[PDB]
Design a protein around this ligand. Structure first.
Ligand SMILES: CC(C)C[C@H](NC(=O)c1ccc(-c2csc(N3CCN(C)CC3)n2)c(F)c1)C(=O)N1C[C@@H](N)[C@H]2OC[C@H](O)[C@H]21
Ligand SMILES: NC(=O)CN(CC(=O)O)CC(=O)O
Length: 216
């Protein structure tokens, strides 16, 4: 039976919360979080991978003007690697590609998409695989103003995805089922950079509409 709750933060699969700053790089933070999870599972090592590597080098994406996580995973597979943050640090602006194979810290052998809208399939992937990259509607002030408890707003638009984040678990709080979401807006946002978002409530904020994970 799939567990009632999963929390990758408790098992050492999740790096500290980052700040994307004034750059449309949410997709790169989402991507590296899912890669970091699979790298720890596979090799036993938790380390920061380079979102700047993805911003500068994923030519199917638009760098600081936005991207998709599936394009990030495809790049790491075709490039035969991604650098560590230490080798290729985040500066929050586009520059020409500085990928160096000597800084290589992970590889990718493809990716898988969660069937669109299917919150049970997303739950099974989080339980069996690890942290999963997800897209949400994060446009409401209620989301901006989150501090505690399970986030639900009937005005969230499941059809208008505009933010990429990382699902690092799920569970239930005082009878409210939730997703555990890592954001890239710094530790001073939300609950130390995290938000619990309503689970099995009409696919709230589109959480299962564009979910994916890398294969290693
Ligand atoms: C998973 C999704 C929802 C994430 C979303 N993704 C896109 O919005 C997106 C935008 C652009 C392209 C693209 C790829 S190639 C190209 N262009 C090439 C030629 N030039 C001429 C035009 C642009 N554009 C893309 F793939 C995707 C995103 O990153 N966003 C949404 C924005 N609100 C930003 O805020 C949060 C995040 O920091 C940014
Ligand atoms: N059945 C379990 O141990 C599930 N765990 C979480 C996990 O395994 O990620 C529950 C908890 O830590 O409260």
């Amino acid at each position: 039976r799939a567990p009632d709750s999963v929390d990758y933060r408790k098992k050492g699969y999740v790096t500290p919360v980052k700040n994307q700053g004034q750059c449309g790089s949410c997709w790169a933070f989402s991507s590296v979080g899912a890669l970091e999870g699979q790298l720890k599972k596979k090799t036993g090592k938790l380390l920061n991978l380079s979102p700047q590597n993805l911003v500068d080098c994923v030519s199917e994406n638009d760098g600081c003007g936005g991207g998709y996580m599936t394009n990030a995973f495809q790049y790491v597979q075709k490039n035969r690697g991604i650098d560590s943050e230490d080798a290729y640090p985040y500066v929050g602006q586009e520059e020409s590609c500085m990928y160096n194979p000597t800084g290589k810290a992970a590889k990718c052998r493809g990716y898988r998409e969660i069937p669109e809208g299917n919150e049970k399939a997303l739950k099974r992937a989080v339980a069996r695989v690890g942290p999963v990259s997800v897209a949400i509607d994060a446009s409401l002030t209620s989301f901006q103003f989150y501090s505690k408890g399970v986030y639900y707003d009937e005005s969230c638009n499941s059809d208008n995805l505009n933010h990429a984040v990382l699902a690092v678990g799920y569970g239930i709080q005082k009878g409210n089922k939730h997703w555990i979401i890592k954001n890239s807006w710094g530790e001073n946002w939300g609950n130390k950079g995290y938000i619990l978002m309503a689970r099995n409530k009409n696919n709230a904020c589109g959480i299962a509409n564009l979910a994916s994970f890398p294969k290693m």
